Amino acid sequence: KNILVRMVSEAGTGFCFNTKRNRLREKLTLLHYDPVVKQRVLFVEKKKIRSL
Amino acid sequence: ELTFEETERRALLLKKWSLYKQQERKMERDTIRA
Amino acid sequence: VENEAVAPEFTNRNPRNLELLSVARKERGWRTVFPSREFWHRLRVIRTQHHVEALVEHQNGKVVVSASTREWAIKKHLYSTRNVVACESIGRVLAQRCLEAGINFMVYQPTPWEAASDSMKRLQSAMTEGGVVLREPQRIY
Amino acid sequence: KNLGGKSSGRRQGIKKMEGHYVHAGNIIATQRHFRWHPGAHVGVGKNKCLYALEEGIVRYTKEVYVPHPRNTEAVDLITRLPKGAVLYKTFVHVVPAKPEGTFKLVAML
Amino acid sequence: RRTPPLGPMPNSDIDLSNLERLEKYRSFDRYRRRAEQEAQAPHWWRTYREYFGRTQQLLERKQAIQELRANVEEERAARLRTASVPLDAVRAEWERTCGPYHKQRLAEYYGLYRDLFHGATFVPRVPLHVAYAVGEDDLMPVYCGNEVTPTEAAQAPEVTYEAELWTLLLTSLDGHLLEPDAEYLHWLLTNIPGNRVAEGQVTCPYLPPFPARGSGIHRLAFLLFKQDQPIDFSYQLAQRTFRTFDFYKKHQETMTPAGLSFFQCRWDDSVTYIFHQLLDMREPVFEFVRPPPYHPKQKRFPHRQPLRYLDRYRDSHEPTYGIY
RNA sequence: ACCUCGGAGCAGAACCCAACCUCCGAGCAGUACAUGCUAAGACUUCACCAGUCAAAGCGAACCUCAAUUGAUCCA
RNA sequence: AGAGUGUAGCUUAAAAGCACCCAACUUACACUUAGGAGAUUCAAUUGACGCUCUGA
Ligand SMILES: [Mg+2]
Ligand SMILES: [Mg+2]
């Protein structure tokens, strides 16, 4: 099973996007495009919105 | 390691073997058809 | 001024006019078939049993330029007409012919194995160093 | 014992037959499988729908089928085809009507 | 209903119960070759093309090839993939042997024949070496359709056609500013005495190319006619106008096109000077105008359409207030 | 027993067609984090709601899947 | 003695395309990549050098 997690930008911007990951995998870090910065920046998982 | 002379000799060896076995297969096929 | 009489709309009949302006259409379909038709000029390489052919062909099928190891001029200067040396030499000759023809860009559409082929790599490098870019400009809409 | 099967028809098929003037972006035909393959100036959507990439006249033709070398299933089919056999498929083309544009005298400098 | 085929259906002859016995395309390459051949072959069904479409020489060549094979260094380089080819010698031999045919192909592709001669073709048997002197040091050659700027073409070119009565004609095919079906004559040297060109009769003085700005790429052709027997020939644009088809219709019996060389030119500051000083006119500036975008007839109630629908049809973006 | 969704017959060939008719399935999973932003033109499950495809452009690199779902209000 | 006569294996190909072979990848084949050899029988459309058939 997977969970929906809010990945938050490490760029200081309050930009968040929801992704999915396995409940049994480590906390998730991605390089996602930040429109505010107009550049790919690191996003780190912050909270679990719901379990899907 | 190896040298240019032996490489050339090996290339000529492959060439002559190509010719020889080509003739071999040609004669074999000729006998087959005959 | 009589010399100033100019028609409101110009009619440039040069077939390569819009192609050089990067404005002409280039067939964008054929997504389920190979090779793609989305090009103005294509570099087509045919490796026969004995010879090597390199054509620059417009999308309409016209063979704009050709370079065959079957021509006396080229075949009288190389040992084998079916080897990597032959492919590189014919590529250089085709590059010169293309530059004198005015073709500077083309779309090469090799199969995976042809692209991996050493002879095709040498031919592409020969064209590149001769001054032909194997990547056509994007159309301007 | 038999449940389901109540789905309605997809209303798929040809939206523009041959000879129909078609503007850029118009959907020519919607299909579940590849019944009609994309021809010249005809693009395929994610769902295999054929849309006109240019403004022109739709023409249906039968053309030899040469799958992309990385299309493994089609390549295997071909590799198993007997010598001399050629596959054919129905292609949809949009013969563009208008020219890309015209050169107009803008200023007599 | 089943209407019978109007001809041999594809894959009909080969089809037979002996599929296992029949050999098969083991290679995508051979299948592609066969498919391309079939596509080229004509068909009775609607198709894409319908809508969008001596002994001494042999002996000498065999001896030369045998000599090249015998030369060990040649074989060494070939097997070491290091041998090269003399590009200049290859070019000269191409000119001598097969250059005319490829040049004819280039002319046909560029549409010179369909425009200069309304379709009638001819192999340019006689090589024609034209070069525009650049500076006092170098010179841009005009091979076939290459690009030469009007700045480079400012002064008349040097022509060296190896032969032993000729007429040379420079014609701009698509530079006409008033007539779609018309030419410009830039210089016409008639009754030239063989190789030397300075002795030709200057029927029309040299006028450098002047492709109008934003008018696209123009094509300029050097037509060389071998003249069987000498014949007499007959800055104002109306008289620089020209129809090579009619000219060759008049001079066909005594003339035969034996050399061809063309190049492509686009606008330049030299074109500006040509227009202002030599031609004494306001240079025309052309722009490529695409057809206006198509929008369906506006509906009173654009159901499900985005708010941009009204913007698609409004002409002025600035606010308007009607009676107020 | 069933109630929603999809595929195949009935419904042979544009589309659409009932049944407490015949059979299969779904209520996900996987990969990616540009599965980013915009925008012509179109399709549309016979209404609407909803659902689809998409040129060009900006910004970049150089999605698979038939179904795989649920409005408003309100939290 | 008479007839058909005649491009490397095949070509209503005109010095070409298919064929064919080893090397590497395959158990192997196949594919692919690298390479290899190759002919218009001899003299002026004609005659005579080689093959097949009809006889002794
Ligand atoms: Mg059904
Ligand atoms: Mg509807």
From Swiss-Prot, chain B:
Domain of life: Eukaryota
Subcellular location: Mitochondrion
Location of this fragment in the whole protein: 105 to 138 of 206
Assigned protein family: Belongs to the mitochondrion-specific ribosomal protein mL40 family.
Gene field: MRPL40
Species this chain originates from: Homo sapiens (Human)
Cysteine pairs bridged by disulfides in the record: none
Protein name: Large ribosomal subunit protein mL40
Tissues where the protein occurs: Ubiquitous.
Subunit structure: Component of the mitochondrial large ribosomal subunit (mt-LSU). Mature mammalian 55S mitochondrial ribosomes consist of a small (28S) and a large (39S) subunit. The 28S small subunit contains a 12S ribosomal RNA (12S mt-rRNA) and 30 different proteins. The 39S large subunit contains a 16S rRNA (16S mt-rRNA), a copy of mitochondrial valine transfer RNA (mt-tRNA(Val)), which plays an integral structural role, and 52 different proteins. mL40 binds to the major groove of the anticodon stem of mt-tRNA(Val) in the central protuberance.
From Swiss-Prot, chain C:
Protein family membership: Belongs to the universal ribosomal protein uL18 family.
Protein name as annotated: Large ribosomal subunit protein uL18m
Keyword Cell inner membrane: no
Cell compartment(s), UniProt: Mitochondrion
Disulfides per UniProt: none
A molecular-function term among this protein's GO annotations: 5S rRNA binding
UniProt keyword list: Chaperone, Mitochondrion, Ribonucleoprotein, Ribosomal protein, RNA-binding, Transit peptide, Transport
Residues of the full protein shown: 39 to 179 of 180
Keyword Hydrolase listed: no
Organism lineage string: Eukaryota, Metazoa, Chordata, Craniata, Vertebrata
Main location: mitochondrion
UniProtKB/Swiss-Prot annotation, chain D:
Family designation: Belongs to the bacterial ribosomal protein bL27 family.
Keywords recorded for this protein, A-Z: Mitochondrion, Ribonucleoprotein, Ribosomal protein, Transit peptide
Gene Ontology terms: cellular component: mitochondrial inner membrane; mitochondrial large ribosomal subunit; mitochondrion
GO terms for MF: RNA binding; structural constituent of ribosome
Subcellular location field: Mitochondrion
Listed GO biological process terms: mitochondrial translation; translation
Gene field: MRPL27
Span covered, complete protein: 40 to 148 of 148
Annotated protein name in UniProt: Large ribosomal subunit protein bL27m
Keyword Transport: no
Subunit and interaction comment: Component of the mitochondrial large ribosomal subunit (mt-LSU). Mature mammalian 55S mitochondrial ribosomes consist of a small (28S) and a large (39S) subunit. The 28S small subunit contains a 12S ribosomal RNA (12S mt-rRNA) and 30 different proteins. The 39S large subunit contains a 16S rRNA (16S mt-rRNA), a copy of mitochondrial valine transfer RNA (mt-tRNA(Val)), which plays an integral structural role, and 52 different proteins.
UniProtKB/Swiss-Prot annotation, chain E:
Coiled coil: 54-82
Location in or out of the cell: Mitochondrion
Pfam families for the chain: PBP (PF01161)
GO terms for biological process, alphabetical: mitochondrial translation
Statement: the UniProt record of this protein carries the keyword Ribonucleoprotein: yes
Stored Gene3D superfamilies: PEBP-like
Entry GO terms, CC: cytosol; mitochondrial inner membrane; mitochondrial large ribosomal subunit; mitochondrion
Main location: mitochondrion
Keywords: Coiled coil, Mitochondrion, Ribonucleoprotein, Ribosomal protein, Transit peptide
Domain of life: Eukaryota
InterPro entries assigned: PEBP (IPR008914), PEBP-like_sf (IPR036610), PEBP_euk (IPR035810)
Keyword Plastid: no
The family this protein is said to belong to: Belongs to the phosphatidylethanolamine-binding protein family. Mitochondrion-specific ribosomal protein mL38 subfamily.
Quaternary context: Component of the mitochondrial large ribosomal subunit (mt-LSU). Mature mammalian 55S mitochondrial ribosomes consist of a small (28S) and a large (39S) subunit. The 28S small subunit contains a 12S ribosomal RNA (12S mt-rRNA) and 30 different proteins. The 39S large subunit contains a 16S rRNA (16S mt-rRNA), a copy of mitochondrial valine transfer RNA (mt-tRNA(Val)), which plays an integral structural role, and 52 different proteins. mL38 is located at the central protuberance.
Protein name as catalogued: Large ribosomal subunit protein mL38
The species this protein was found in: Homo sapiens (Human)
